[PDB]
Amino acid sequence: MKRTELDMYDDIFAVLERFPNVHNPHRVRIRRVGTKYFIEMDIEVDGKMSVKDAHELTVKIRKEMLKRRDDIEDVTIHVEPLGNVE
Amino acid sequence: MKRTELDMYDDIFAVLERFPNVHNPHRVRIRRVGTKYFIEMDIEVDGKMSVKDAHELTVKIRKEMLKRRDDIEDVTIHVEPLGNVE
């Protein structure tokens, strides 16, 4: 770990806190490629949430991530039920 | 493309046909690493399907994939709503 690598995790977790139905963000990983960064993560949602709603959630999360940092190129979000065993 | 690369896509698509609520499998990709193969795909499900049910579906699909071919090491499945715009 280094200080710059921390600022980024702080901003990612900072954006997720905005979303009340996002739970237990984990496997949060960053890759650097030139100027721009690629972000991947798992989130948990109520098992009763529809695929429509969960998909809309990941679209809005990526949108907010890209608005926050001008150096994030893409964000991929895997959706799991609350209390998943991978 | 080569003949051996076809046999594999045939077996993957052959297993998905087993599942009636799996729709429009796409971005179906194979990576070779030594003896064993890594499979990634997108599927579409009814937007009204729960995250619990969709997750259970991907678990059963991976299980059936691994049972069919002894040379598949892992299978990751992305779930989208019917008629998704990536």
From TrEMBL, chains A, B:
Cell location: Membrane
UniProt domain Cation efflux protein cytoplasmic: residue ranges: 7-81
Binding-site positions, Zn(2+): H26, D42, E80, E86
Family label: Belongs to the cation diffusion facilitator (CDF) transporter (TC 2.A.4) family.
Name of protein: Uncharacterized protein
Shown chain mapped onto the complete sequence: 209 to 294 of 306
